Design a binder for this molecule. Structure first.
Ligand SMILES: CCCCCCCCCCCC(=O)OC[C@@H](COP(=O)(O)OCC[N+](C)(C)C)OC(=O)CCCCCCCCC
Ligand SMILES: CC(C)CCC[C@@H](C)[C@H]1CC[C@H]2[C@@H]3CC=C4C[C@@H](OC(=O)CCC(=O)O)CC[C@]4(C)[C@H]3CC[C@]12C
Ligand SMILES: CC(C)CCC[C@@H](C)[C@H]1CC[C@H]2[C@@H]3CC=C4C[C@@H](OC(=O)CCC(=O)O)CC[C@]4(C)[C@H]3CC[C@]12C
Ligand SMILES: CC(C)CCC[C@@H](C)[C@H]1CC[C@H]2[C@@H]3CC=C4C[C@@H](OC(=O)CCC(=O)O)CC[C@]4(C)[C@H]3CC[C@]12C
Ligand SMILES: O=C([C@H]1COc2ccccc2O1)N1CCC2(C=Nc3ccc(Cl)cc32)CC1
Ligand SMILES: O=C([C@H]1COc2ccccc2O1)N1CCC2(C=Nc3ccc(Cl)cc32)CC1
Lengths: 99, 191, 50
């Protein structure tokens, strides 16, 4: 478990820096305050694991749908990647007990 | 004689990748706790230049990132012709590496042409109502076009920053604890 | 991921035929996706026990 937490931290830090670099210039022009600082990006992507981060945390108010669609794609890829790392941690924990 | 051994070459490459990731972290260091530049306001800090010159000028950290990615494209293009487009394109992580480098290159290409348009508009007209050729400058974030060449750069730069963390898999199978873990991930990725 | 609410499928009129079709289709979609995920897990287990 403590070896897959490193992979979790790597994917988390990568997507945190990416979405903070994407959404930092829209701090007052979003629906909520997510991804506008490092603290808000942290508490969005952490509670997205347990389903406590809403999907409207990624939309903006302007007509820049380029950056909004980048945010949708990045957030979906983050969720699928986290589910895949969890499903591999489960198989590693099974193999570590069948020995 | 020590610095040309294989293990020290591996340590030097890992250190250069660590410097590149630290540069990608510390590039957005003025906005960690708040931007202090609202999308409605505008700041020039010189009272002669327009607003689109402050947002398009390359910093020294961006110049270092451009230097690192130019070195990466050079070290990849040196190796694609050594193996040909049969051993290179067959591996599917070379697709991810070439995609990350291409997205970085497209981001810097879009930022350069945005800066070129801004510098041309500031050069041809060096507080009254400006004419209808540089009036789409000195404007806030609301009144940009949806296809502005700076938001294309800012959109591709985030994807490239996410994808650049995938190069940990090139230095990770050298470890006795995270090598078989990567082997198990690659075993299960096919299904 | 559970980020789509269940009131995304109801309408304002009194056409409850189409609304009940939507409920049944959305429930069948959710159960089918859970079944495909549970089969992907078993395939990933079998691909590692070899
Ligand atoms: C519409 C749906 C959208 C789908 C998107 C979901 C993305 C799926 C990601 C799967 C990653 C994986 O299993 O990769 C397996 C192994 C490589 O195996 P091998 O086949 O051994 O590859 C060998 C690679 N090589 C050693 C040759 C360089 O990956 C790793 O090594 C993980 C790396 C650790 C941290 C990386 C952070 C990533 C942040 C984005
Ligand atoms: C190494 C490999 C695996 C890279 C995989 C590709 C994707 C991760 C990237 C590269 C191309 C990107 C796309 C390029 C073009 C479009 C259309 C664009 O649509 C609009 O701009 C809306 C209209 C407007 O207001 O301009 C939004 C971003 C988007 C979806 C991008 C989404 C993310 C993409 C798919
Ligand atoms: C929070 C995350 C994003 C960390 C940020 C990136 C780096 C600071 C980390 C990630 C990957 C790490 C590397 C993973 C593997 C190794 C191998 C290790 O050497 C060996 O195990 C082999 C020695 C032998 O041959 O006997 C030296 C450290 C190093 C390079 C690590 C150095 C620090 C790295 C670059
Ligand atoms: C190949 C096999 C597996 C097909 C399985 C059958 C179902 C997928 C379909 C066929 C019959 C359908 C039903 C036919 C009749 C009804 C009642 C109807 O109720 C109302 O109209 C409310 C009152 C009104 O305002 O009229 C709504 C649709 C519903 C539930 C349908 C739901 C979906 C059903 C079950
Ligand atoms: O939700 C998403 C992301 C979620 O994460 C993803 C992860 C991997 C692949 C796809 C993903 O889609 N989007 C993006 C695409 C979107 C934007 N405009 C259109 C137009 C037509 C269609 Cl058919 C779709 C769209 C809708 C919202
Ligand atoms: O939520 C659903 C769906 C969800 O997906 C399904 C998937 C497979 C099978 C059943 C499913 O029910 N419905 C449909 C049925 C409904 C409409 N009118 C009545 C009246 C009495 C009862 Cl007892 C039930 C109902 C309630 C709402």
């Amino acid at each position: 478990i403590f070896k897959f937490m490193v992979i979790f931290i790597m994917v988390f830090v990568a997507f945190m820096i990416g979405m903070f670099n994407l959404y930092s210039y829209y701090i007052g022009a979003k629906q909520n305050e997510a991804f506008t600082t490092v603290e808000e990006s942290f508490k969005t992507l952490f509670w997205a694991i347990f389903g406590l981060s809403e999907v409207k945390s990624v939309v903006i108010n302007y007509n820049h749908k380029f950056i909004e669609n980048i945010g949708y794609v990045l957030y979906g890829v983050y969720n699928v990647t986290m589910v895949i790392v969890l499903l591999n941690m489960l198989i590693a924990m099974i193999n570590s007990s069948f020995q | 004689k020590i610095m040309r051994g294989p293990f020290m070459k591996f340590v030097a490459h890992a250190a250069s990748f660590t410097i590149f990731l630290g540069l990608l972290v510390m590039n957005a260091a003025d906005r960690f706790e708040g931007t202090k530049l609202l999308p409605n306001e505008t700041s020039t800090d010189n009272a002669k230049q327009l607003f689109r010159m402050k947002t398009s000028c390359f910093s020294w950290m961006e110049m270092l990132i451009i230097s690192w990615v130019i070195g990466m494209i050079w070290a990849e293009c040196k190796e694609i012709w050594t193996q040909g487009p049969k051993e290179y394109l067959f591996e599917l992580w070379n697709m991810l590496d070439f995609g990350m480098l291409a997205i970085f290159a497209a981001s810097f290409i879009a930022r350069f042409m945005a800066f070129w348009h801004a510098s041309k508009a500031q050069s041809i007209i060096d507080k009254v109502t400006l004419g209808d050729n540089v009036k789409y400058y000195n404007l806030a974030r609301i009144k940009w076009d949806p296809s502005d060449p700076q938001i294309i750069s800012e959109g591709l730069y985030a994807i490239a920053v996410v994808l650049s963390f995938s190069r940990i898999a090139y230095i990770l199978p050298a470890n006795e604890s995270f090598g078989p873990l990567q082997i198990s991930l690659g075993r299960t990725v096919k299904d």
